[PDB]
Amino acid sequence: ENFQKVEKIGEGTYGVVYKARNKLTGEVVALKKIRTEGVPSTAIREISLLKELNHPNIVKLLDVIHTENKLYLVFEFLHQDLKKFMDASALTGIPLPLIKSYLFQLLQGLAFCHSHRVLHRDLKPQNLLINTEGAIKLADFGLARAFGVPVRTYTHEVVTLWYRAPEILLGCKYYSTAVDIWSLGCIFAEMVTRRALFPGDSEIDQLFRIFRTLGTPDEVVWPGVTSMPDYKPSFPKWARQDFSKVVPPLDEDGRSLLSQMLHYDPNKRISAKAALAHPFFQDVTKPVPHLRL
Numbered sequence: 185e186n187f188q189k190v191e192k193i194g195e196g197t198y199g200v201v202y203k204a205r206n207k208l209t210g211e212v213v214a215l216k217k218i219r220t221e222g223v224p225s226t227a228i229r230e231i232s233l234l235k236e237l238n239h240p241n242i243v244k245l246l247d248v249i250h251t252e253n254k255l256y257l258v259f260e261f262l263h264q265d266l267k268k269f270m271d272a273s274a275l276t277g278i279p280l281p282l283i284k285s286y287l288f289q290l291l292q293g294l295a296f297c298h299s300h301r302v303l304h305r306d307l308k309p310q311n312l313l314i315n316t317e318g319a320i321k322l323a324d325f326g327l328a329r330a331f332g333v334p335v336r337t338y339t340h341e342v343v344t345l346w347y348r349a350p351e352i353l354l355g356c357k358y359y360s361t362a363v364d365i366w367s368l369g370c371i372f373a374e375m376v377t378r379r380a381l382f383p384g385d386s387e388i389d390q391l392f393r394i395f396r397t398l399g400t401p402d403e404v405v406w407p408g409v410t411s412m413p414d415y416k417p418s419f420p421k422w423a424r425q426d427f428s429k430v431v432p433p434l435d436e437d438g439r440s441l442l443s444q445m446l447h448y449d450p451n452k453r454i455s456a457k458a459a460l461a462h463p464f465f466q467d468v469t470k471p472v473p474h475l476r477l
C-alpha cells in the first residue's frame with residue numbers, strides 16, 4: 185500500500201521478503217511478510233521487543249505491522265548476503281583478512297544478542313547481510329523463539345539443516361546460545377574451504393556427516409549424550425578425523441578457534457565473548473569487500 189514493492193528478494197524462512205520503497209520517507213527497506221488463525225499475541229509482543237535491539241552487527245528491525253490481521257516486518261535494507269558473496273568469491277576464495285573481519289563482527293553481534301537473552305537459532309549464509317563498507321550483519325532471527333518451527337519454510341521450500349547444532353538434531357528441547365556458535369563455526373569453515381562443512385540432505389544424514397567428521401560422540405566427550413531424546417545406541421561409531429584435514433589450509437589459530445566452536449557438549453562450546461578474545465583475532469582489521477551490485 186505505502187510501498188512500491190521494488191522486487192522480491194527472496195523466500196525467507198518465515199515468509200517472502202521484498203525490497204520496497206516507502207512513499208513517505210523515500211526510504212528503501214526490506215519487507216518480510218509472515219504467515220491464518222488470527223495469529224498469537226505472544227509473538228507480537230516478543231517480536232516488538234526486538235525493535236529495541238540495536239547494534240552495528242544486527243540488521244535493524246524498524247517496524248512491526250500487524251494490520252489487516254497480517255504480520256509484516258520492516259527491516260533496514262542491505263544489498264547482498266554472504267551466500268551470494270561466497271558464490272561470487274568461489275574462484276579465488278574470500279581473503280583471510282576479510283573472513284577474519286566477518287567472523288569477528290558476527291561474534292560481536294552474537295555476544296550482543298546473547299547478553300540480551302536473544303538467540304538466533306537459524307544462522308546460515310543467507311541470513312548474513314553485507315554492505316560496501318565492510319560490515320556484516322545478522323538478519324532474520326525469526327525469532328524462531330517468538331514463533332515456532334513447523335515442517336517447511338513457507339510453501340514447499342526445503343529447510344537447510346547444514347548449520348544445525350548436534351543437540352538440536354538429537355532432540356534437545358531447550359536450545360542455548362551454544363547453538364548459534366555451532367552454526368557460526370560451520371559458516372567460518374565454509375568461508376575458508378569454499379564448500380559447506382556438513383551438507384546433510386536429511387536430519388540423520390546431517391547428524392552422521394557430523395559424526396563422520398568429529399567422531400561419534402560418547403559420554404566421555406559429551407556427558408549426557410546417550411540420554412538425549414533421539415539418541416540411539418545403534419548409531420555407528422566413527423573415529424574423529426584429524427582436524428587438519430577439515431579446513432585446510434587454515435592456520436593453527438583458526439583451527440583452534442574452530443575446534444572450540446564445534447565442541448559437541450554445548451557447555452564446553454566457546455562463548456561468543458570468549459571467542460572474541462581468541463588469539464586468531466590479534467591481527468584483525470576491517471577490509472573493504474569487492475561487491476558487484
Ligand SMILES: O=c1c(O)cccc2cc(O)c(O)c(O)c12
Nearest residue numbers: 196201214259260261262323324
Ligand atoms: O531482514 C531480512 C530477513 O529477516 C530475512 C530474509 C532476508 C533479508 C534480505 C535482505 O536483503 C535484507 O536486507 C533483509 O533485511 C532480510
